[PDB]
């Protein structure tokens, strides 16, 4: 099977440097062109750059022109963005693609990763819970997080019907919040144990919360 | 080369066709392709050369046009086809993608569960006060959410998050979030959510009084 798989994102402060690889399987890359495609937050897909490897022939978004470079190393089968003098303006996910010709379209993508161009320091969330009180509700209130992502399951994932996790969203304070909650029975809220499974991999935090009535 | 993307936005209900615009300001002959993107995770090619459907791709998707003109056509629109669709334009570097266009499925309306949540205990030791409302399972998406604190309407003090459309039922979830220092919270005793939707026949409020009253 055909497959791009992407490494190499994060957190980097304003002014730094990046490196972001996309390792090619089942084609080699010199038989088409590679392309970086970004989308920022709450923002359209934006074309960077592309490279055809067999002739190292390039071009760049006129925005990103001189500060990024496009390589490849047709050795390894993989493709590279250099990244540098990194600006908010760059945090984005970040796709690596192959253009398929016959006339064509991007037909192989990456998974994408996350860059965030920040000063901020990385911070792991508090976890308060949202206490309930037939259906009731509760959940688990994530909150003073950075960067992104966080992940949130419940009873470790043995509940998943009816759990709804809410984006994040940035607070003023330059720090991420979301909530998670679950419906359940009612009767069951003061036999039935609920506890939030929270995640920050970027700070190394690994929260587990129980959420009772109050 | 500018591709623009019309209309912006949509609804449409399951089964009806839905036809998508995509203009360029030169003649791309037929250089143009139709992505899905799904929220959070990487675009999927549906339509390359403006017409070729791509191997896999469900046979209600379909594409025409060349040299200025071309749409994107989905014949019998289902609960999972929400997504943001993009054209692309690639007969001269620098390629070029459109804004995109939000395709929504309609149903039937569907009025929100409201439940409330107070801080709790850790949360105010750490000096802050988190209330939280909840809106589970609704259509439209449009809803009006206000807090009110001792009867007085709330300002510039809270901020909402929605999920991304339910793929089976077609449905949203709503979160708003009231931020207050402890000091502030605790000079209040009661503490509401009132929620205005098409689905409600008059405006629902859920509230607590602080201090288990």
């Known amino acids: 099977e055909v497959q791009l798989v992407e490494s190499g994102g994060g957190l980097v402060q304003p002014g730094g440097s990046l490196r972001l690889s996309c390792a090619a399987s089942?084609?080699?890359?010199?038989?088409?062109?590679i392309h970086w495609v970004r989308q920022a937050p709450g923002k359209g897909l934006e074309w960077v750059a592309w490279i055809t490897p067999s002739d190292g022939n390039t071009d760049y978004a006129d925005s990103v022109k001189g500060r990024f470079t496009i390589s490849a190393d047709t050795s390894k089968n993989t493709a590279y963005l250099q990244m540098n003098s990194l600006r908010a303006e760059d945090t984005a996910v970040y796709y690596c693609a192959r253009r398929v010709c016959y006339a064509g379209g991007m037909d192989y993508w990456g998974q994408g990763t996350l860059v965030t161009v920040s000063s901020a320091s990385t911070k792991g969330p508090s976890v308060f819970p949202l206490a309930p009180s037939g259906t009731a509700a509760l959940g688990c209130l994530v909150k003073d997080y950075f960067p992104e992502p966080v992940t949130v399951s419940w009873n470790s994932g043995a509940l998943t019907s009816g759990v709804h996790t809410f984006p994040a969203v940035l607070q003023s304070s330059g720090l991420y919040s979301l909530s998670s909650v679950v419906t359940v029975p009612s009767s069951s809220l003061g036999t039935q144990t609920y506890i939030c499974n929270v995640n920050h991999k970027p700070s190394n935090t690994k929260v587990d919360k129980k959420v009772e009535p109050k | 080369i500018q591709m623009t993307q019309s209309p912006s936005s949509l609804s449409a209900s399951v089964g009806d066709r839905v036809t998508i615009t995509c203009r360029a300001s030169?003649?791309?002959?037929?250089?143009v392709a139709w992505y899905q993107q799904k929220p959070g995770k990487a675009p999927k090619l549906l339509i390359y050369s403006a017409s070729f459907l791509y191997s896999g791709v469900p046979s209600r998707f379909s594409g025409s046009g060349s040299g200025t003109d071309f749409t994107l056509t989905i014949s019998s629109l289902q609960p999972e086809d929400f997504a943001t669709y993009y054209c692309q334009q690639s007969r001269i570097t620098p390629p070029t993608f459109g804004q995109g266009t939000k395709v929504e499925i309609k149903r039937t309306v569907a009025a929100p569960s409201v439940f409330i949540f107070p801080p709790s205990d850790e949360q105010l030791k750490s000096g802050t006060a988190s209330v939280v409302c909840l809106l589970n399972n609704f259509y439209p998406r449009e809803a009006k959410v206000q807090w009110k604190v001792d009867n007085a309407l709330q300002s510039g003090n809270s901020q909402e998050s929605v999920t991304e459309q339910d793929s089976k039922d077609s449905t949203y979830s709503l979160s708003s979030t009231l931020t207050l220092s402890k000091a502030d919270y605790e000079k209040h005793k009661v503490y509401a959510c009132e929620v205005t939707h098409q689905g409600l026949s008059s405006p629902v409020t859920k509230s607590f009084n602080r201090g288990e009253c």
């Open positions: 089942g084609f080699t890359i010199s038989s088409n062109s």
């Open positions: 030169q003649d791309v002959s037929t250089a």
